[PDB]
Design an enzyme around this catalytic site. Structure first.
Site, PDB file in Angstrom:
ATOM      1  N   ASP A  15      37.238 -33.057  -8.925  1.00 28.39           N
ATOM      2  CA  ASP A  15      37.739 -33.185  -7.560  1.00 28.39           C
ATOM      3  C   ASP A  15      36.549 -33.029  -6.614  1.00 28.39           C
ATOM      4  O   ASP A  15      35.478 -32.598  -7.037  1.00 28.39           O
ATOM      5  CB  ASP A  15      38.815 -32.126  -7.276  1.00 28.39           C
ATOM      6  CG  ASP A  15      38.307 -30.704  -7.444  1.00 28.39           C
ATOM      7  OD1 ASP A  15      39.145 -29.779  -7.495  1.00 28.39           O
ATOM      8  OD2 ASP A  15      37.078 -30.500  -7.519  1.00 28.39           O
TER       9      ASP A  15
ATOM     10  N   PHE B 208      33.626 -22.142 -10.287  1.00 22.69           N
ATOM     11  CA  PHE B 208      34.504 -22.291  -9.118  1.00 22.69           C
ATOM     12  C   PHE B 208      34.759 -20.947  -8.439  1.00 22.69           C
ATOM     13  O   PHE B 208      34.895 -20.862  -7.215  1.00 22.69           O
ATOM     14  CB  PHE B 208      35.850 -22.903  -9.532  1.00 22.69           C
ATOM     15  CG  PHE B 208      35.896 -24.403  -9.445  1.00 22.69           C
ATOM     16  CD1 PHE B 208      34.835 -25.124  -8.897  1.00 22.69           C
ATOM     17  CD2 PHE B 208      37.024 -25.097  -9.869  1.00 22.69           C
ATOM     18  CE1 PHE B 208      34.898 -26.515  -8.769  1.00 22.69           C
ATOM     19  CE2 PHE B 208      37.099 -26.485  -9.745  1.00 22.69           C
ATOM     20  CZ  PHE B 208      36.034 -27.195  -9.193  1.00 22.69           C
TER      21      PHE B 208
ATOM     22  N   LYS C   4      43.206 -36.151 -12.265  1.00 23.93           N
ATOM     23  CA  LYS C   4      42.956 -34.730 -12.045  1.00 23.93           C
ATOM     24  C   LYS C   4      44.094 -33.869 -12.585  1.00 23.93           C
ATOM     25  O   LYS C   4      43.872 -32.997 -13.432  1.00 23.93           O
ATOM     26  CB  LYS C   4      42.758 -34.434 -10.560  1.00 23.93           C
ATOM     27  CG  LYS C   4      42.405 -32.972 -10.297  1.00 23.93           C
ATOM     28  CD  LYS C   4      42.263 -32.677  -8.813  1.00 23.93           C
ATOM     29  CE  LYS C   4      42.166 -31.178  -8.562  1.00 23.93           C
ATOM     30  NZ  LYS C   4      42.076 -30.851  -7.105  1.00 23.93           N
TER      31      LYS C   4
END
Ligand code: CA
Ligand code: CA
Length: 311
Positions: free
Chosen positions: A256, A307, A237
């Site tokens: 994630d 997001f 990540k």
DNA sequence: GGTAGACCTGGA
DNA sequence: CCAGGTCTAC
């Protein structure tokens, strides 16, 4: 007036402007959204932080982006604003990127309408590396606090506005110095204090210093990703965060648990190859391919947009 | 060799 | 007591 943080409407003679529509950028959506952690909205609609080793304040209207720099006071020069252009990667037109993702993803289509102005910041590799090493098992509020104390502790002092003293991000040798870990643990970084210290030393005492990290911008994404993972505290990540945010690799998609929920709820996604029903080295890698396949070369930027909308 | 558990520590 | 990232013991 000549003190503290400035405002467009209180010190006009010192504000230059970069032609930029609010559709191409929204400071309130990019600055505090987990990319950079050194930006503070000191006064309403005004953001202050260190850019190009100088303190700036940015505020925008509708067709302009107003900038003022704190180095004899005077509006930003041509070269300086150009630095701000580079930081916000403005040559990269969002109108074009949104049109593309939208035309190949009907879900992005709806969701993205209400969240224009989300782009990726072109950050410095070191700042990203250690900021993101601290992101582990954490949140933006906490990461920001940690990074703020880390720079107060090891960063060069720049200038002071009101009761805020700005510091540049620590150098490699500073973080690699003796007893930095013990010091960072006193700053509440926890086990992250160890990774910071080790990576600082690793890069300088094994990888060939700063230049090694830099050169990764000219390397391929798959090559640059593999390089970063070598560093202690850097997993898949964080490697993708650094690749996407500082190494000019826009197709890097940091996977994630968050991305997972957006995959199952918005795309009914399921792992094919990997036999693991949930997250795992294989499945996360697979998930990243899914979106790169879906959105294309800039799958990383698309993720940012999604997001934010999920915020 | 894919998969639990520790690592710090603040919230559970 | 354990995340939700990385690292490591089977
Ligand atoms: Ca690693
Ligand atoms: Ca749907």
């Amino acid at each position: 007036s000549e003190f503290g943080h400035r405002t467009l409407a209180s010190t006009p003679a010192l504000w230059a402007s970069i032609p930029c529509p609010r559709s191409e950028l929204r400071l309130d959506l990019v600055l505090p959204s987990g990319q950079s952690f050194r930006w503070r909205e000191q006064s309403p609609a005004h953001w202050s932080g260190v850019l190009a080793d100088q303190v700036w304040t940015l505020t925008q209207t509708e067709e302009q982006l107003h900038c003022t720099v704190y180095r004899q006071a005077s509006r930003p020069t041509p070269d300086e604003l150009e630095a701000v252009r580079k930081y916000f990667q403005l040559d990269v037109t969002l109108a074009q990127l949104y049109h593309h993702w939208g035309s190949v993803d009907s879900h992005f289509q709806e969701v993205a309408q209400k969240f224009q102005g989300v782009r990726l910041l072109r950050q410095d590799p070191i700042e990203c590396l250690f900021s993101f090493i601290c992101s582990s098992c954490n949140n933006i509020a906490r990461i920001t606090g940690m990074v703020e104390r880390l720079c107060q502790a090891f960063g060069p002092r720049l200038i002071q506005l009101d009761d805020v003293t700005y510091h540049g991000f620590p150098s490699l040798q500073a973080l690699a110095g003796p007893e930095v870990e013990a010091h960072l643990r006193k700053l509440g970084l926890g086990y992250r204090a160890r990774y910071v210290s080790a990576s600082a030393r690793a890069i300088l005492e094994e990888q060939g210093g700063l230049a090694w990290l830099q050169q990764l911008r000219e390397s391929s994404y798959e090559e640059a990703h593999k390089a970063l993972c070598i560093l202690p505290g850097v997993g898949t990540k964080v490697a993708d965060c650094i690749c996407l945010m500082a190494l000019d690799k826009p197709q890097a998609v940091p996977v994630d648990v968050h991305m997972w929920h957006i995959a199952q709820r918005d795309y009914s996604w399921h792992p094919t190859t990997s036999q693991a029903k949930g997250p795992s080295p294989q499945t996360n890698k697979e998930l990243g391919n899914f979106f790169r396949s879906l959105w294309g070369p800039y799958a990383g930027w698309a993720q940012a947009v999604l997001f934010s909308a999920d915020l």
